Every structure is written in structure tokens, then in C-alpha cells.
Design a protein around this nucleic acid. Sequence first.
DNA 1: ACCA
Lengths: 5, 336
Amino acid sequence: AXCXX
Amino acid sequence: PVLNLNDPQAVERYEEFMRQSPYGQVTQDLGWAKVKNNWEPVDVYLEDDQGAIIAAMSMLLGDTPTDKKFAYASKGPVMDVTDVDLLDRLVDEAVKALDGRAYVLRFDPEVAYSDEFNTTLQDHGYVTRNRNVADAGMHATIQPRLNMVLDLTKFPDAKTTLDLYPSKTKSKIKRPFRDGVEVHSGNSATELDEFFKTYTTMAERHGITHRPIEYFQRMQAAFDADTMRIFVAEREGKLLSTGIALKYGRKIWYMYAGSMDGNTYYAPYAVQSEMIQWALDTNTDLYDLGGIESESTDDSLYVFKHVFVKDAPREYIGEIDKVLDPEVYAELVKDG
DNA sequence: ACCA
């Protein structure tokens, strides 16, 4: 959830 | 057509289109389904009159608190999405393949935002998520919409990383190497363990969430060492910082990083320098440092990445939603 | 304080 990827 | 994943000849044909397209993305490669092994893959393509693939969409289906799946084509499709008539045909194929199991098909291609493109997408019935949700920050979208991308085609005669930069930045880059930092690279279990130690250490330090090691192991098993490379910076046997970079299509993408506590001897600058060098050595068009929150010196993401990218951040069109079940869509998605 |  946090950087995407 | 829909891709039969149990047909190796079809799969190799699909992969060869993906790997050679200038629109190719690692997250659209079929190997990405192996990374995202908790999602269900559904892949479609279009053929021209000769039967050659000219457009492909790799989707992954995820669960929701409703009866419906969320279907997501990460940085897809692989085609010129500004050719919206062609996009409607490919999305039409994707919708038939989904068979009413998903409430939305979302794709977030790496194409610049523009008012005219946004208006066209909306005219064709898509719901777009970009400047209308900007106030919710970097995580208003799944992937960051603002990205720091180094255009290496502006420097056709650059031989080394330092050839890209003003004297003041040259100094910054030279610093870790002068002070003994050395970087090696590879894609074995050894480097993965080195990355993971720095990754979990950074994660605990910033108080953020982090992926299990099996995520990265699956990614290592899916991609060869000419596609995925882990860079490891040390000083005299001491582990300092790492980064994972993926080379695919027109870009090398710096996707994951970690660094130990305390003094790193500017090792993160040395990792970047070697990742950029890889891009130069393979004549790659772009080096993508990935997302920022805002183009502002208050954003530590932008400040660090601004050392390597003096051009403006690229701003993409964001998320494009083909709404299939509007009642569930309104329940699960807020339009800013 | 910053080096996701």
C-alpha cells in the first residue's frame, strides 16, 4: 500500500 | 481474440509482440501474472488483415467486497492508446473475455495527460481519473501519475552517466565512488537477499508497508538477467543500498530500492549512476525513476529524483475506467 | 531534516 509496482 | 494460456505457440506469439513493441511494458508482460500470482490473468489481442498482432491487453482480475472482480491492465494496453477507435476495439475484446465477471476494466497507460485526449476518452464513454482526483495525493491512483523520466535520446553521444549532467551534479555522483562505494549487479539469489535486507530495513525506518520476499523471487524466476537486474552498493564489505531495475520496451525502470540505517556514503547516488549506465550501454531510450507526489521541494521523492531528471515530471492521463457494472462502480470508486 |  505504501508505491504501486 | 482471447489468449489461450495453455497454448505455448499462441503465448510465444503474444510475448514476441509485447517484447518488440515500442509500447511494451513489463507490467503487461505475461511474466507479470506470475509475479501477481494472487490475481487471475485474462489476456486479449487484435490482429491486422495479415493476422499479425497489432494490439494486446494483459489484464489481472482481483477480488473485491462484492460479487464482482476488479479487472486491471497495469500500464496497458500495448498499442497507441491515442488511436481511440483502435482502443475501443481492443477494449471490446477485453469485455467479451471478462464475461460479466468484473465491475470495471481499468488501464493506466504511460501517455501524457492532455485536455483533448481526456475529453475524447470521456466522449467514448470511459470514466477518467487524473486531475479530478489530484487533491488526494500520489495514491489517488494505483500507480503514481507524475513520474520522473530521463530522456536519453537528448544525449546521443553520451558514453557514461556523467556525460548527462552539469558539473555540480557530476560532483554529487562522483562522491560515493571517491569515498570507496562499489556497485555490482546481477539477478541471483545472492543479490536478492542483499536487496531484501536493505528493503525491509528501509521499510521499518519509514514506517511503510513492504512486500514479502516471495514477490521478488517470483519476479526473478519470471525475468532473465538481461531484463531484471539488482544493483548492490557496498563499501569495504559493508552493505549500504540496493535497487532493482527492469529493462523492457523503450525504458529501464528503477522500480524498487532499499538502504541501510545511518550513513550510506551517498550509495543511492551510485546505484542510480550504474542503472543509468546500463541504459546507456544498451541504447535504451528512457530511464524512468518513477513516481513523485508533487513537483515541489517539499516532496522528498521529487527532490532526490530531481538530481537525475532536470526536465519536468511527465504527467500521464492516469486511470481510464471501462465501467461495466455501474452500481458496484459507484459503491467502490469515488470520482474526486 | 533528505537518500521509497
